[PDB]
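for ur thesis appendix - Receptor tyrosine-protein kinase erbB-4. copy paste whatever u need, i formatted it the way the template wanted (i think)
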Amino acid sequence: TAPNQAQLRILKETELKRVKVLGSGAFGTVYKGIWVPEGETVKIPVAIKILNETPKANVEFMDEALIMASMDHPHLVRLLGVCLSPTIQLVTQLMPHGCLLEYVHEHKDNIGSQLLLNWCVQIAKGMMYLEERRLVHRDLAARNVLVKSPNHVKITDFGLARLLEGDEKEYNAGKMPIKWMALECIHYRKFTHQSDVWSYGVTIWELMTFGGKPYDGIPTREIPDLLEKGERLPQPPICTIDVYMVMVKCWMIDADSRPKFKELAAEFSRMARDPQRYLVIQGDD
Ligand SMILES: [Mn+2]
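the 3d part is after this line
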């Protein structure tokens, strides 16, 4: 593997102004901010993520920062962006419209097939680049896709992301939710680009259901057995069989036979050219 000479930019605190909290909870807190780069005049709208005040959490936050600093893809969040005082804070370009999961909930009456299919394309496009860099996300979900503008989304939350090396074709070990993980990850902790493909299935299913909760009301405990029996997520009411089939191909038992991100991008691209062919939504063309 080629050596990684990405440049990590260390930001002085005086360069950053925190304006508003965007979100908080167990994971830590994200702010909206202005960043003025040393020593320029331009004001860059910014997201500033810190941990809440609680062993390996700081080290891993930095690992996450390294990943975001090493890539330049239109559909992957890029670090700007690290400040150290008074605690670690990751600084990324502001995504005005928040996370995609909430976005599709709020605007459900307003979202057409064109945007939904396009999101399938972009997310698959981002994941594609991750494959080329041999990075397994391990935690792909609609809550980890952010919205820059209606027709431009980015994958984020690389905190559990792992870089495959040498001959390694899987990663073995975090707390990504079981309802989005591949059956072989549940059983053998066998994380690959192909398990990510499963997660993508669930992700795009969250979209077609306008922020549906997968297997809703079924305890996590019962999930492994549900999926052993062959049960999968239902056909969303807007989905033609063409679209659902793609989802079902991602949830097949043989990981290797699953479609690849490269193939999923090309396929949803084909659908994107005639959207109303493929998703059937009230009030749309
Ligand atoms: Mn539960």
